[PDB]
């Protein structure tokens, strides 16, 4: 319950791999993450939804753990509906 929103930041390796794990999500699944960051990080909700600007060094620790937790749920499966 509180481990997600009151989490500590992940390392540079993990943040970078998180950029890579969202890159793995097919457009359908991907649209969630683009939305997640934009929803949690108001400062980048000005980014065009087609070309969203994510700054992994500014995202909240909970944002990272929402992004990672969500994508890993997808990667750890046969994620080939639109890919």
């Amino acid at each position: 319950s509180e481990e997600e929103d009151k989490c500590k930041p992940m390392s540079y390796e993990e943040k970078r791999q998180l950029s890579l794990d969202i890159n793995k999500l097919p457009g359908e699944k991907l649209g969630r993450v683009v939305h997640i960051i934009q929803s949690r990080e108001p400062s980048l909700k000005n980014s065009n939804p087609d070309e969203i600007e994510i700054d992994f060094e500014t995202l909240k620790p909970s944002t990272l753990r929402e992004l990672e937790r969500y994508v890993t749920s997808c990667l750890r499966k046969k994620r080939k509906p639109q890919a």
Binding site: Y12, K15, R16, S19, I22, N23, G27, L30, G31, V33, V34, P49, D50, E51, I52, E53, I54, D55, F56, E57
Partner: peptide, 12 residues
């Protein structure tokens, strides 16, 4: 210095 330009949701 890490930026993720996720390019998607483009209208078709």
């Amino acid at each position: 210095e890490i930026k993720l330009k996720i390019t998607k949701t483009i209208q078709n």
